Design a protein around this ligand. Sequence first.
Ligand code: OAV
Length: 188
Amino acid sequence: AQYEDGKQYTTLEKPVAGAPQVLEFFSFFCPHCYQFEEVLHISDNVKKKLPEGVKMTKYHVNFMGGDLGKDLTQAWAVAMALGVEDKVTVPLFEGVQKTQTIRSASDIRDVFINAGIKGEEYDAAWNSFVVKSLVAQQEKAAADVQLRGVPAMFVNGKYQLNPQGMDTSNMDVFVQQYADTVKYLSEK
Ligand SMILES: CCN(CCn1cccn1)C(=O)Cc1ccc(Oc2ccc(C#N)c(C)c2)cc1
């Protein structure tokens, strides 16, 4: 077959019932995740190749970056609660990996303030139990599939993308192969 288990994707031993339709995991410390956002725009191209209104979920992970890695998961929960993912994703990535100006939770906060989120608004969300629950959902989804590496995408809690099995000579061909595989698994 053109799409084969083990080539463009793998199948989880234990499927996760009730998982989001398209679930991505990333970390701002993850170098390929930087490429996936700034260079390849994987999420946007995947969303485009999916039907209108299909839910896509993107979660941060703790296992990279020690203390600051956990701060960034809580901050991503703040981004999701306020709906400002599209405003902080790039400066958080560049702050961690490019300029390396993010070394504390306050430095993360500065990215949100520079993005236009008010101080009282960020601090209230940061300490809110709505964000606490959002942090738990990110941890629960990662623990559900024993996640040990990022970037990672899961389709309907049963299939895991395998980008190592695609072509990486052409960036644009890789993205299109990746998105078509998500679409293929979506229709399974
Ligand atoms: C979860 C495993 N994991 C972590 C460990 N790890 C580090 C390096 C390799 N593995 C991954 O990063 C897996 C991975 C993902 C994608 C990928 O393919 C490309 C990456 C970037 C670009 C660009 N620009 C292209 C075109 C393709 C290759 C590997």
